[PDB]
Amino acid sequence: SLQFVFACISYAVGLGNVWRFPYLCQMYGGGSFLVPYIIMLIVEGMPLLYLELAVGQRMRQGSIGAWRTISPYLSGVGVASVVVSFFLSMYYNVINAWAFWYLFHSFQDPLPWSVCPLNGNHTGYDEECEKASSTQYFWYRKTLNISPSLQENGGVQWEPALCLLLAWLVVYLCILRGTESTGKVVYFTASLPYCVLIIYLIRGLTLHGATNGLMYMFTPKIEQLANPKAWINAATQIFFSLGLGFGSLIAFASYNEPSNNCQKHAIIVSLINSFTSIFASIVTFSIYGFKATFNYENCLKKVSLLLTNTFDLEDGFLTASNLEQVKGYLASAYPSKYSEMFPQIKNCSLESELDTAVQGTGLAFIVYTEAIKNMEVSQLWSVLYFFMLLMLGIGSMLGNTAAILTPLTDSKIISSHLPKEAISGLVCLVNCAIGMVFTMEAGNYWFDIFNDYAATLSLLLIVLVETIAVCYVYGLRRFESDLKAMTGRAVSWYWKVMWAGVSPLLIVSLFVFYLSDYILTGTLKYQAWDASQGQLVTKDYPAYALAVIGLLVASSTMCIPLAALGTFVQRR
Amino acid sequence: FVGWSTDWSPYADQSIKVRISLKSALGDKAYEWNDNEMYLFRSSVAYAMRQYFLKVKNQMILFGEEDVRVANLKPRISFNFFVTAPKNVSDIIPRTEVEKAIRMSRSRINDAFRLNDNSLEFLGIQPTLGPPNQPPVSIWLIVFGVVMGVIVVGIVILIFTGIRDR
Ligand SMILES: *[C@@H]1O[C@H](CO)[C@@H](O[C@@H]2O[C@H](CO)[C@@H](O[C@@H]3O[C@H](CO)[C@@H](O)[C@H](O)[C@@H]3O)[C@H](O)[C@H]2NC(C)=O)[C@H](O)[C@H]1NC(C)=O
Ligand SMILES: *[C@@H]1O[C@H](CO)[C@@H](O)[C@H](O)[C@H]1NC(C)=O
Ligand SMILES: *[C@@H]1O[C@H](CO)[C@@H](O)[C@H](O)[C@H]1NC(C)=O
Ligand SMILES: *[C@H]1O[C@H](CO)[C@@H](O)[C@H](O)[C@H]1NC(C)=O
């Protein structure tokens, strides 16, 4: 019936493809990132997803159990499947906290991101809130209070810490309460995000100059298309959105009937996830194009006002459509006055704005707040959208935490020492203690680091190990025979070829390209807020941050080889 | 210094510069700025001066439209005006008093031409937007406290029921 479709939609639609995907798309030029994602979908999404589902269905065990049954000296990879997930639980719930924050400041008629604060004379506006948008100022100063550089970090901000604690308490409450009622919750928690996105798409399409963002997002600029970073980010983003590497898919497939259809399920899940990501990107980039058009018009209006004031022209004489001609006439009339203010004139174009209108890890928040502030009843739409985002994040965190706790629940030794319910509380407390780091003044930089590298290489390596083990260790023919015995209609040659020599080769090639690019450039930099310019400036990563990122990647990557060496020693 | 400059004028020290942007504030349906509009503006300035001299210094000075002298008129509608004594040309009201008078009654001048503090700039008189009123303590804190309380109550009751069942 429709219950299965709703469950598939709920498993496919999450906070990931709604939040992380638009930011990655904006960072890597839009279309130049959109094209690989579709390419990385039909090559890596469906085949690997179907492989994981088939393994979970055939093995009838958990991730650790399945990867131990496949091979002893490989069982440690299952442990890695938890560790990476743990790192996700380290930071992902922090996003929910931000949602809570943006929810809590949604019951005021003077919305905090709607009107800039006064400078102090009650005559103008703050310099930071004037150079930057009101939403940007509220996000970077009144919400994150971000430091200009990563080197200087302040104390733990109390309000974000309280928001994070509330988010963890909500997660723990949902863990304790919700165990099998989700079938009813699927009737409501699967269609609301689509309705919210439809409403926001309508609002964006009703805004002036919104088609520019849609054109930008669909424009495949070949100059930035050759960047291996875009391919790597698309691959890790689709792997994260589909849940590959986390092992939750295997656990879910182990709970289904042996005769349950898997190819149709995997294809439907992948296609729904891709379509939802594309739709969210469409809406977000429509609002982003609206912002870029507004900034371009504001810059042109400021330039025209400055020229009119300093050359005493008529109010309506100078317009955007005839700017350069009037500039040439002024230069030809008296070049002395024109040159007296030539450096003050600023050249602003739609391309530059669309490149650097809004960027960073909080692109979705800023963009949707801008969309909200131009509504009719801003509070209602703000509350609805933030509640939808919070629900999606809660569902994603519930899935991640269940995947983490399942191997711990299966641990007989741990179960016999402590109550099963107290394990969830201990895990939540530890995760909150670890994630309190993100609540500092410079916690946004660490959040960006853990969103860029704590799941980039780890997921790729885990998927590569899994597909190598399936294709060559266990034997492709044996797996195909087992699947045919279980359900019939053996895998077509397309799936066999993809599992044998397409996906692993592409993953290895992408990893080699990324490593070569990193070695050649050697200039891994991060964006940092600049209140003086009211923008984002690239700054080189410090030694300690690079070491921390390297350690975070290395632990997840070496979780499997260390256990393999231990198993080899035990056998020997 | 041998020579002279063609910019200095004896009335430049006490002159207040007005810049008017009718097209930006009104878009369409914008009236033309002929001499009648200048007469109306001078009358409004004289009225503001009368109001300041009556309600602050308690002096009845009969200003007129001919006591607001205007110079350097431009197509931008940008000029310099200064107010003299009612019948003493050699007496020019100091710029501080004129600025205080304009600040006192800028709303009437703004409404006379349907302009709002951005299309009628006096270049030295900076308007005040107004202090932003704040909630009693915090709406967000109250909502957060209520949500945290209900969540804690739910957690406690669920834990108690689970313990009692087993
Ligand atoms: C028109 O306004 C001007 C001011 O701009 C008036 O000039 C002022 O006239 C008074 C009366 O004579 C002057 O006071 C006297 O100054 C002399 C200077 O040596 C002093 O010796 C006297 O004891 C007395 O204090 C005042 O200085 C003068 N101010 C200026 C700036 O010239 C003028 O009287 C007004 N005309 C009329 C008809 O009211
Ligand atoms: C606000 O008042 C102070 C008073 O010292 C002044 O320095 C500052 O320039 C004023 N702000 C603006 C925007 O003029
Ligand atoms: C704008 O273009 C002119 C044309 O050469 C250039 O000289 C100037 O540096 C550019 N930037 C600004 C801010 O004027
Ligand atoms: C701004 O403040 C000044 C004095 O502080 C006051 O006269 C003026 O009316 C205010 N403007 C408003 C409240 O719009």
PDB file of N, CA and C in Angstrom, chain A residues 28-66:
ATOM      1  N   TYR A  28      30.477  25.171  -5.037  1.00  0.00           N
ATOM      2  CA  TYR A  28      31.173  24.689  -6.228  1.00  0.00           C
ATOM      3  C   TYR A  28      30.505  25.143  -7.520  1.00  0.00           C
ATOM      4  N   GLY A  29      29.949  26.354  -7.530  1.00  0.00           N
ATOM      5  CA  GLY A  29      29.492  26.979  -8.754  1.00  0.00           C
ATOM      6  C   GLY A  29      28.110  26.594  -9.231  1.00  0.00           C
ATOM      7  N   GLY A  30      27.416  25.700  -8.533  1.00  0.00           N
ATOM      8  CA  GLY A  30      26.076  25.327  -8.944  1.00  0.00           C
ATOM      9  C   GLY A  30      26.029  24.209  -9.965  1.00  0.00           C
ATOM     10  N   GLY A  31      25.830  24.571 -11.236  1.00  0.00           N
ATOM     11  CA  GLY A  31      25.733  23.562 -12.281  1.00  0.00           C
ATOM     12  C   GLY A  31      26.974  22.697 -12.383  1.00  0.00           C
ATOM     13  N   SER A  32      28.154  23.308 -12.247  1.00  0.00           N
ATOM     14  CA  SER A  32      29.397  22.546 -12.288  1.00  0.00           C
ATOM     15  C   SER A  32      29.468  21.511 -11.174  1.00  0.00           C
ATOM     16  N   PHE A  33      28.670  21.675 -10.120  1.00  0.00           N
ATOM     17  CA  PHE A  33      28.501  20.652  -9.099  1.00  0.00           C
ATOM     18  C   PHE A  33      27.265  19.794  -9.323  1.00  0.00           C
ATOM     19  N   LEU A  34      26.227  20.345  -9.958  1.00  0.00           N
ATOM     20  CA  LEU A  34      24.993  19.590 -10.154  1.00  0.00           C
ATOM     21  C   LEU A  34      25.190  18.450 -11.145  1.00  0.00           C
ATOM     22  N   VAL A  35      25.946  18.692 -12.219  1.00  0.00           N
ATOM     23  CA  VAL A  35      26.141  17.658 -13.237  1.00  0.00           C
ATOM     24  C   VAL A  35      26.846  16.425 -12.680  1.00  0.00           C
ATOM     25  N   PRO A  36      27.963  16.538 -11.945  1.00  0.00           N
ATOM     26  CA  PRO A  36      28.568  15.318 -11.382  1.00  0.00           C
ATOM     27  C   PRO A  36      27.641  14.552 -10.455  1.00  0.00           C
ATOM     28  N   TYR A  37      26.813  15.255  -9.677  1.00  0.00           N
ATOM     29  CA  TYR A  37      25.938  14.583  -8.720  1.00  0.00           C
ATOM     30  C   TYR A  37      24.999  13.612  -9.424  1.00  0.00           C
ATOM     31  N   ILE A  38      24.406  14.042 -10.539  1.00  0.00           N
ATOM     32  CA  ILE A  38      23.602  13.127 -11.343  1.00  0.00           C
ATOM     33  C   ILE A  38      24.476  12.012 -11.902  1.00  0.00           C
ATOM     34  N   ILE A  39      25.680  12.358 -12.368  1.00  0.00           N
ATOM     35  CA  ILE A  39      26.604  11.345 -12.873  1.00  0.00           C
ATOM     36  C   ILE A  39      27.016  10.392 -11.762  1.00  0.00           C
ATOM     37  N   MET A  40      27.317  10.920 -10.577  1.00  0.00           N
ATOM     38  CA  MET A  40      27.697  10.088  -9.444  1.00  0.00           C
ATOM     39  C   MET A  40      26.528   9.290  -8.880  1.00  0.00           C
ATOM     40  N   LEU A  41      25.298   9.604  -9.283  1.00  0.00           N
ATOM     41  CA  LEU A  41      24.118   8.897  -8.801  1.00  0.00           C
ATOM     42  C   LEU A  41      23.910   7.572  -9.526  1.00  0.00           C
ATOM     43  N   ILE A  42      23.834   7.610 -10.859  1.00  0.00           N
ATOM     44  CA  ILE A  42      23.602   6.398 -11.637  1.00  0.00           C
ATOM     45  C   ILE A  42      24.796   5.460 -11.638  1.00  0.00           C
ATOM     46  N   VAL A  43      25.956   5.921 -11.179  1.00  0.00           N
ATOM     47  CA  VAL A  43      27.159   5.107 -11.133  1.00  0.00           C
ATOM     48  C   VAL A  43      27.425   4.573  -9.732  1.00  0.00           C
ATOM     49  N   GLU A  44      27.283   5.416  -8.709  1.00  0.00           N
ATOM     50  CA  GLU A  44      27.588   5.024  -7.343  1.00  0.00           C
ATOM     51  C   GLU A  44      26.368   4.856  -6.452  1.00  0.00           C
ATOM     52  N   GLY A  45      25.299   5.615  -6.670  1.00  0.00           N
ATOM     53  CA  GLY A  45      24.158   5.548  -5.780  1.00  0.00           C
ATOM     54  C   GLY A  45      23.387   4.247  -5.855  1.00  0.00           C
ATOM     55  N   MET A  46      22.721   4.015  -6.986  1.00  0.00           N
ATOM     56  CA  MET A  46      21.882   2.827  -7.128  1.00  0.00           C
ATOM     57  C   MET A  46      22.658   1.521  -7.004  1.00  0.00           C
ATOM     58  N   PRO A  47      23.793   1.317  -7.690  1.00  0.00           N
ATOM     59  CA  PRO A  47      24.469   0.010  -7.573  1.00  0.00           C
ATOM     60  C   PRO A  47      24.922  -0.310  -6.160  1.00  0.00           C
ATOM     61  N   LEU A  48      25.595   0.630  -5.495  1.00  0.00           N
ATOM     62  CA  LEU A  48      26.078   0.374  -4.144  1.00  0.00           C
ATOM     63  C   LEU A  48      24.932   0.257  -3.147  1.00  0.00           C
ATOM     64  N   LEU A  49      23.874   1.056  -3.314  1.00  0.00           N
ATOM     65  CA  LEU A  49      22.716   0.927  -2.436  1.00  0.00           C
ATOM     66  C   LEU A  49      22.070  -0.446  -2.576  1.00  0.00           C
ATOM     67  N   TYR A  50      21.902  -0.919  -3.814  1.00  0.00           N
ATOM     68  CA  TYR A  50      21.322  -2.241  -4.023  1.00  0.00           C
ATOM     69  C   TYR A  50      22.242  -3.334  -3.496  1.00  0.00           C
ATOM     70  N   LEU A  51      23.557  -3.154  -3.636  1.00  0.00           N
ATOM     71  CA  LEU A  51      24.499  -4.123  -3.086  1.00  0.00           C
ATOM     72  C   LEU A  51      24.372  -4.211  -1.570  1.00  0.00           C
ATOM     73  N   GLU A  52      24.303  -3.060  -0.896  1.00  0.00           N
ATOM     74  CA  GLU A  52      24.157  -3.062   0.556  1.00  0.00           C
ATOM     75  C   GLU A  52      22.837  -3.694   0.978  1.00  0.00           C
ATOM     76  N   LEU A  53      21.749  -3.365   0.275  1.00  0.00           N
ATOM     77  CA  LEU A  53      20.455  -3.951   0.611  1.00  0.00           C
ATOM     78  C   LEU A  53      20.463  -5.462   0.413  1.00  0.00           C
ATOM     79  N   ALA A  54      21.065  -5.933  -0.681  1.00  0.00           N
ATOM     80  CA  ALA A  54      21.135  -7.368  -0.932  1.00  0.00           C
ATOM     81  C   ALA A  54      21.974  -8.075   0.123  1.00  0.00           C
ATOM     82  N   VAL A  55      23.100  -7.475   0.518  1.00  0.00           N
ATOM     83  CA  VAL A  55      23.929  -8.075   1.561  1.00  0.00           C
ATOM     84  C   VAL A  55      23.158  -8.153   2.872  1.00  0.00           C
ATOM     85  N   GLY A  56      22.471  -7.069   3.239  1.00  0.00           N
ATOM     86  CA  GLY A  56      21.700  -7.078   4.471  1.00  0.00           C
ATOM     87  C   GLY A  56      20.573  -8.092   4.452  1.00  0.00           C
ATOM     88  N   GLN A  57      19.908  -8.240   3.304  1.00  0.00           N
ATOM     89  CA  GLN A  57      18.803  -9.187   3.210  1.00  0.00           C
ATOM     90  C   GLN A  57      19.298 -10.628   3.237  1.00  0.00           C
ATOM     91  N   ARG A  58      20.399 -10.915   2.539  1.00  0.00           N
ATOM     92  CA  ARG A  58      20.881 -12.290   2.455  1.00  0.00           C
ATOM     93  C   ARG A  58      21.536 -12.733   3.758  1.00  0.00           C
ATOM     94  N   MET A  59      22.338 -11.862   4.375  1.00  0.00           N
ATOM     95  CA  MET A  59      23.092 -12.275   5.552  1.00  0.00           C
ATOM     96  C   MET A  59      22.210 -12.413   6.787  1.00  0.00           C
ATOM     97  N   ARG A  60      21.096 -11.679   6.843  1.00  0.00           N
ATOM     98  CA  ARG A  60      20.151 -11.753   7.960  1.00  0.00           C
ATOM     99  C   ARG A  60      20.831 -11.443   9.292  1.00  0.00           C
ATOM    100  N   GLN A  61      21.776 -10.506   9.268  1.00  0.00           N
ATOM    101  CA  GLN A  61      22.519 -10.129  10.462  1.00  0.00           C
ATOM    102  C   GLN A  61      22.762  -8.628  10.442  1.00  0.00           C
ATOM    103  N   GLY A  62      23.322  -8.127  11.541  1.00  0.00           N
ATOM    104  CA  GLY A  62      23.724  -6.741  11.621  1.00  0.00           C
ATOM    105  C   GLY A  62      24.983  -6.477  10.820  1.00  0.00           C
ATOM    106  N   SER A  63      25.359  -5.198  10.764  1.00  0.00           N
ATOM    107  CA  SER A  63      26.525  -4.802   9.980  1.00  0.00           C
ATOM    108  C   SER A  63      27.784  -5.508  10.470  1.00  0.00           C
ATOM    109  N   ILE A  64      28.037  -5.460  11.780  1.00  0.00           N
ATOM    110  CA  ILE A  64      29.203  -6.142  12.335  1.00  0.00           C
ATOM    111  C   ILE A  64      29.094  -7.644  12.109  1.00  0.00           C
ATOM    112  N   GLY A  65      27.914  -8.212  12.365  1.00  0.00           N
ATOM    113  CA  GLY A  65      27.721  -9.633  12.128  1.00  0.00           C
ATOM    114  C   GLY A  65      27.897 -10.015  10.671  1.00  0.00           C
ATOM    115  N   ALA A  66      27.361  -9.199   9.758  1.00  0.00           N
ATOM    116  CA  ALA A  66      27.477  -9.506   8.336  1.00  0.00           C
ATOM    117  C   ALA A  66      28.926  -9.446   7.868  1.00  0.00           C
TER     118      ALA A  66
END
